[PDB]
Design a protein around this ligand. Structure first.
Ligand SMILES: [Zn+2]
Lengths: 1095, 346
């Protein structure tokens, strides 16, 4: 489908002689042009050879004129690799792949697989497992439990402290995991060089019995029960099958199967091996068959429930009314209105059996060059894959996993072979990683740095970078761009849609998927440590356990004005255009002091409406340029904060001690929504801002990165949007952001940040400060997507935190445990900073300066597009070049457009037929811009086109936009332009509409040929300029630019120009020449001589 | 010409904000002694709606035009440095778009460098909005000559993201590295060089547009300082001090803003106006440093103006200040001598 070997020499013409790299490019291109569609893998490899031929030529010859054309050809290649893989439509191998590596299949997983088996009976079920990988889960649970006990007894005197960072406990627990895993791998290496070979289960049995107080018969019973369950549920073994062919793949699979216990990466590798050896579809157990689109075609949409939670409602109702999966907890569906439930009842009971309640597609049109992957949060997720036998792109995914594990092993095996403590080996591993650092793979090494910590310490996510979605995204970038072994280069979401799993075939928003989406982060780590210390010794050991009391202390204004404001050291250095309603909701001193300090951060632009006592709330703000506290009514403002554009509500309270807490300040999401509604009604009479922001602050109030709609801030925002957009005008839904801090941080006199712990005072838990400041993002509704996105974090702020970590690690008065905790925190911070660049999560500036730039880019893209389909139209129906298109006259004529082309040598008009309506739209836009330019030129004298200067800005910007558009069209050069000459077409149209009548009325071909010749000859400058570089004075008389016309009239003395200047404009120019003076004097003398005669 | 335009630029810079109203050109004509063209000194020169002044630079030219509000601003401008063409219009704001010069007859090799300097922005820097560098797909090296301290205003330099075939694009700044801090707003990188050169608080901003959108662009730019070179953007972000770049004065407005307690005016280009400008058939003064309205007595280039405490407009007739009596002409300049107020000739 690419251009032939010809038409390229006409494109890449250069003064340099044709180089041998250019000859290689031409040979590769022609050898690709002559090829057969069969064996798409080689059809792909020819393109993947031509591409690097072009890349080598460009890199070698940077200052080469050819590099223009070949860059457009590479882009064409980028749009041709998509065409390939769109030819094959063969049905996918009718196999459904499920993976359960290690442990036994849960009955929930089996019930989930039952839907796929029953509904898609055409496909056979493949539940992958291993013969000797059944006790890995037991070993992992045993080691983590023993290490938890060891760490708790090691820090027993410290864990009793309510304000104790659980990261130290996790550090000790990881030291113990690494010790136990080193013991296990030493045992495995010792017992693997034995006569014959023991099964991995045998080594695990021996280790568990000898060290972990286990019984062999229990392990054997578990093994046989798991084997029976898996086999009865369509179990397929891996060891007893040809799946582990390459030794490197076996090494990297056993790298997480037994060295680490990371069965997730084992699944990520065995799924790829299964999809390569055989074909079919892989699905994680959490996924469910899709529903029919038309089954719920009606619109019971509440518009107050998130679009994802709407799918959750659909599935929950489906499996609650007609029970398909056991114990499908309806905690989300069974709270909606009764009419909606009755409608769902009618819909579900009005259908046929299970075969039609859920969709089932056998029309999976994939190619052997392609794999499909599910989508989540606008990124790839390997929860659902489709690929034939030995798919080439799948092979690219295996190659990417192999390269990533090659780097990780190369930098880790030297660190782990030397027998050292966990801290020492991690230090060595990090040193090797960052000594081998490169600009290309800096984020990769940042992500894989806590490889030994994945699954056991919070915020450790390296599987995503080695075998998870990162590897698949890199493989997709390799496939689209024909590259190889790319690490961090990402693919735009527009080009990623072609590989998407069919949306009808997947119900991703599933209860088990949602349950598994909860990442092991600081938020979850807090409650995991709390559970550990609840199971050990006893007692709540909670932060709220410390004298949480319900006193009603009013504001000590003297305390605020004498200790809070004077001692303030936090500098905002931002915008400060906000009114900050510090609505403290709990009367305890823990919230009271946080309230006072947060007031002290910016006392003037902040007001306290403390709600410790119900019917006494009063705005305790600061007097205008004074040292006094002025007390208005509830939620009132000093009336000097009337022009403030932002309302920063900062509800202070204590959230419930539960993961994903449901109640904040003892008020749930609905009660707090009502409170915010009363807030908005009260402030509607005072302030009408533009950006509302809620800043919930308190213990157990994290900013969760996953399952945002299930979070307290997310549900709160989902509640207060109608009230925000109605009560407060000029506040669109996307301007509301809700955050959730956990600690109140101040800067003391020595510059050290301190947190108000629940034990009173201001403790200096530096790791807690920097983790809390790092882990906070603002949930905001996205009206363009009807989803709750997260605002970009303060990247300069995150880098400031990272630099603080750097300098504070440089200090020698810090514990080694704290040293490595802060190193890991810095790693996470820089990984998040890299993620905001890798995931395309940063929005453009979107202002007047950028809009003109962005609109120009969009115009250029549409220009290239239109040139592309006009090249397509000039390829078929012959008509290639030298038949300049006439955009002025395009006729729809009953949904089949008839466009006119004009030959160069003669005025030959052919009204070819096209079906695409894009030509009409582009012609309309071109005519509009040319009309704007023509209206900017009120008159032309002797074809000089006197500009009509407009001093208003609107006309100036309109004229400049039209001039940019037309000049970009006129000066166009491209790979397609040589066979198209779109630039010549637009230049001809502009010359016709300006110098003569419109191109619609120029059917007379004899003068049309002259018009074609003249338009191409001269260059028309349509850009707004008073003087076209001529060093002359400019005479602009009440709008008309006349200086150039007068100068050329007085220099050349064109009689025509004088005539049209006298007539059209009304300009008389005095010729001060001596010759004209002599002629006029002679004229007058002759007239005097002849007139006085009387004959 | 080059000499007269250089003198005009010196006069504009040496002015105290009186550089954009129509009366400014009358002051310039008095300074250049344009009355000597006719022969007598009592000539009142009329600066009308469509008055145009074209000044030739050693590189190119700049054309200023008068507006409907009797304000003079850059209508057009173009200057070429044999490697980079810089063009300013009025419809795209007052933005200097710097692009690599597209050599005709493309058979010859195409240059990869694209330089920029503050030299051509002398004097007219008070009319410029921003500098938009627009490298093409052939641009590999971008030289930013930041060592020019004889200016007053340093427009933000916006480097547009190039959809280029080059693996790396080099931004070479002719300055040190300890001066620069960095920041981000949206998906744009920001490098701010703040220094004290001859008691001048020079602050130069260089943002790169859309450079944080994807790793294809983040890892493409390489920063080259005078002391340390071949720095990637990640190196800058991990080694250089970071500041907060968002400010209220950088938003987009069309009229009067009351930011904090200071009033600013955003003209048609949604940019702050600076100096003594005509607004709504009234004369206002904005500080040539902070661009905010000032009320009271202002000595602009030696001439005293009074601006109302409430509305900020300039007094243009007999006025009573603190009980005392003052006289101002229609241009707002305080007058000395005997003049007729309502009470009589004072
Ligand atoms: Zn609390």
């Amino acid at each position: 489908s690419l251009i032939s070997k010809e038409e390229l020499i006409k494109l890449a013409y250069s003064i340099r002689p044709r180089e041998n790299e250019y000859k290689t490019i031409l040979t590769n291109l022609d050898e690709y042009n002559k090829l057969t569609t069969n064996n798409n893998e080689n059809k792909y490899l020819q393109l993947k050879k031509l591409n690097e031929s072009i890349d080598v030529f460009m890199n070698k010859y940077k200052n080469s004129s050819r590099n223009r054309a070949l860059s457009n050809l590479k882009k064409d290649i980028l749009k041709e690799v998509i065409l390939i893989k769109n030819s094959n439509t063969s049905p996918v191998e009718k196999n459904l792949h499920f993976v359960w590596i290690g442990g036994e299949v849960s009955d929930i997983a089996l019930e989930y697989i039952k839907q796929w088996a029953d509904i898609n009976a055409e496909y056979n079920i493949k539940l992958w497992y291993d013969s000797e990988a059944f006790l890995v889960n037991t070993l992992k649970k045993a080691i983590v439990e023993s290490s938890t006990t060891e760490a708790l007894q090691l820090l027993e005197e410290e864990i009793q402290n309510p304000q104790f960072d659980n990261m130290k406990f996790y550090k000790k627990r990881m030291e113990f995991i690494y010790d136990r895993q080193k013991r296990f791998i030493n045992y495995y290496k010792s017992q693997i060089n034995k006569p014959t070979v023991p099964t991995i289960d045998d080594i695990i049995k021996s280790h568990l019995v000898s060290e972990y107080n286990r019984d062999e018969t229990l392990l054997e019973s578990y093994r046989t029960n798991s084997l029976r369950k898996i086999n009865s549920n369509h179990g397929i073994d891996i060891r007893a099958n040809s799946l582990f062919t390459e030794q490197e793949l076996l090494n990297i699979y056993s790298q997480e199967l037994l060295n680490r216990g990371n069965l997730a990466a084992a699944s990520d590798i065995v799924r790829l091996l299964a999809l390569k050896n055989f074909g079919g579809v892989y699905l994680d157990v959490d996924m469910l068959p899709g529903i029919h689109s038309d089954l719920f075609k009606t619109i019971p949409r509440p518009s107050s429930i998130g679009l994802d939670r709407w799918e959750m409602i659909k599935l929950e109702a489906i499996m609650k009314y007609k029970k398909y999966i056991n114990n499908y907890t309806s905690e989300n569906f069974d709270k909606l209105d009764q009419q909606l439930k009755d409608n769902f009842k009618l819909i579900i009971e009005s259908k046929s059996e299970k075969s039609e309640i859920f969709s089932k597609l056998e029309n999976l049109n994939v190619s052997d060059l392609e794999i499909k992957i599910a989508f989540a949060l606008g990124s790839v997720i390997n929860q659902a894959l489709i690929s034939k036998q030995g798919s080439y792109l799948t092979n690219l995914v295996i190659e990417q996993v192999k390269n990533r594990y090659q780097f990780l092993n190369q930098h880790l095996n030297p660190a782990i072979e030397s027998d050292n403590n966990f801290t020492d080996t991690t230090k060595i591993f990090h040193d090797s990683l960052f000594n081998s650092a490169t600009a290309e793979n800096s984020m990769f090494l940042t992500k894989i740095a806590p490889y030994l910590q994945v699954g056991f310490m919070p915020e450790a996510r390296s599987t995503i970078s080695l075998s998870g979605p990162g590897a698949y995204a890199s493989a997709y970038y390799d496939f689209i761009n024909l590259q190889e072994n790319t690490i961090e280069k990402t693919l735009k979401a527009s080009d990623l849609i072609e590989f998407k799993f069919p949306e009808n075939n997947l119900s991703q928003l599933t209860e088990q998927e949602i349950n598994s989406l909860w990442s092991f982060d600081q938020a979850s780590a807090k409650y995991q440590f709390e559970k550990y210390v609840r199971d050990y010794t006893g007692g709540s050991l909670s932060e709220d356990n410390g004298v949480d009391f319900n006193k009603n202390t009013a504001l000590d204004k003297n305390y605020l004005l004498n200790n809070k404001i004077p001692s303030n050291n936090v500098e905002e250095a931002g915008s400060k255009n906000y009114v900050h309603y510090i609505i403290q909701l709990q009367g305890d001193d823990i919230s009271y002091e946080a309230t006072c300090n947060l007031f002290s951060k910016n006392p003037k632009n902040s007001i306290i409406i403390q709600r410790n006592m119900n019917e006494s709330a009063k705005s305790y703000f600061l007097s205008d340029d004074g040292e006094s506290i002025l007390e208005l009514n509830k939620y009132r403002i000093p009336e000097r904060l009337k022009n403030k554009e932002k309302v920063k509500v900062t509800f202070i309270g204590h959230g419930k001690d539960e993961f994903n807490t449901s109640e904040f300040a003892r008020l749930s999401v609905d009660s707090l929504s009502n409170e915010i509604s009363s807030f908005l009604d009260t402030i509607k009479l005072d302030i009408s801002p533009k950006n509302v922001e809620v800043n919930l602050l308190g213990c157990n109030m994290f900013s969760y990165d996953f399952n945002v709609e299930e979070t307290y801030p997310g549900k709160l925002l989902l509640s207060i949007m109608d009230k925000i957009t109605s009560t407060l005008p000029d506040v669109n839904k996307d301007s509301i952001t809700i955050g959730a801090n956990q600690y109140e941080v101040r800067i003391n006199s020595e510059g050290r940040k301190e947190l108000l712990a629940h034990s009173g005072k201001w403790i200096n838990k530096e790791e807690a400060i920097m983790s809390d400041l790092s882990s906070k993002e603002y949930i905001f509704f996205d009206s363009i997507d009807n989803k709750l996105k997260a605002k970009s974090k303060n990247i300069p702020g995150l880098a400031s935190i990272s630099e603080d970590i750097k300098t504070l690690l440089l200090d020698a008065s810090v514990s080694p445990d704290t040293k490595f905790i802060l190193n890991n925190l810095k790693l996470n911070i820089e990984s998040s900073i890299g993620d905001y660049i890798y995931y395309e999560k940063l929005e453009p500036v979107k202002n007047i300066i950028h809009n003109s730039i962005d609109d120009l880019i969009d115009e250029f893209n549409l220009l290239e597009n239109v040139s592309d389909e006009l090249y397509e139209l000039k390829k078929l129906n012959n008509l290639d070049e030298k038949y300049l298109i006439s955009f002025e006259d395009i006729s729809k004529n009953n949904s089949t457009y008839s466009v006119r082309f004009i030959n160069k040598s003669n005025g030959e008009s052919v009204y070819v037929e096209t079906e695409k309506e894009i030509f009409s739209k582009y012609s309309e836009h071109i005519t509009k811009e040319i009309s704007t330019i023509k209206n900017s030129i009120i008159t032309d004298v002797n074809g000089n086109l006197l500009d009509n200067i407009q001093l208003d800005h609107t006309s100036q910007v309109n004229t400049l936009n039209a001039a940019f558009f037309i000049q970009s069209l006129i000066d166009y050069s491209s790979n397609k332009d040589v066979l198209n000459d779109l630039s010549t077409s637009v230049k001809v149209q502009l010359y016709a509409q300006l110098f003569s009548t419109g191109l619609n009325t120029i059917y007379d071909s004899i003068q049309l040929v002259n018009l074609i010749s003249n338009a191409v000859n001269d260059t028309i400058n349509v850009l707004p300029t008073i003087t076209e570089g001529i060093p002359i004075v400019s005479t602009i008389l009440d709008g008309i630019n006349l200086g150039a016309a007068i100068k050329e009239l007085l220099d050349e003395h064109d009689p025509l120009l004088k005539k049209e200047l006298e007539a059209k404009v009304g300009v008389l120019a005095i010729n001060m020449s001596l010759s004209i003076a002599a002629t006029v004097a002679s004229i007058v003398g002759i007239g005097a001589e002849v007139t006085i005669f009387l004959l | 010409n080059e000499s007269v335009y250089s003198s005009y630029l010196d006069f504009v810079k040496n002015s105290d904000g009186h550089h954009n109203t129509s009366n400014f050109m009358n002051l310039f004509l008095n300074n250049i002694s344009f009355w000597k063209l006719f022969g007598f000194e009592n000539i009142n020169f009329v600066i009308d709606k469509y008055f145009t002044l074209v000044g030739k630079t050693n590189l190119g030219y700049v054309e200023f035009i008068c507006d409907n509000n009797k304000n003079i601003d850059i209508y057009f401008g173009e200057w070429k440095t044999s490697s980079s063409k810089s063009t300013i219009f009025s419809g795209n704001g007052r933005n200097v778009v710097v692009e690599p010069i597209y050599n005709p007859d493309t058979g010859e090799d195409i240059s990869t460098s694209l330089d920029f300097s503050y030299e051509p922005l002398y004097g007219i820097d008070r009319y410029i909005n921003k500098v938009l560098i627009a490298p093409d797909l052939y641009t590999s090296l971008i030289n930013i000559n930041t060592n020019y301290y004889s200016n007053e205003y340093y427009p933000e330099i916006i480097v547009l993201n190039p959809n280029t075939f080059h693996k790396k694009v080099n931004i070479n700044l002719d300055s040190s590295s300890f001066e620069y801090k960095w920041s981000t707003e949206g998906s744009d990188f920001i490098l701010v060089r703040y220094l004290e050169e001859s008691n001048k608080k020079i602050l130069q901003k260089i943002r790169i547009k859309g450079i944080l959108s994807n790793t294809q662009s983040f890892n493409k730019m390489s920063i080259d300082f005078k002391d340390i070179k071949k720095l990637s953007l990640g190196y800058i972000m991990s080694n250089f001090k970071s500041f907060n770049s968002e400010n209220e004065l950088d938003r987009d407005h069309l009229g009067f803003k009351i930011i904090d307690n200071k009033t600013y005016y955003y003209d048609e280009d949604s940019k702050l106006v600076k100096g003594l400008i005509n607004i709504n058939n009234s004369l206002f003064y904005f500080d040539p440093i902070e661009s905010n309205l000032v009320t009271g007595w202002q000595t602009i280039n030696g001439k005293k103006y009074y601006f109302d405490i409430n509305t900020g407009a300039a007094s243009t007739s007999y006025k009573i200040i603190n009980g005392k009596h003052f006289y101002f002409n229609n241009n707002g300049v305080m007058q000395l001598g005997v003049f007729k107020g309502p009470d009589g000739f004072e």
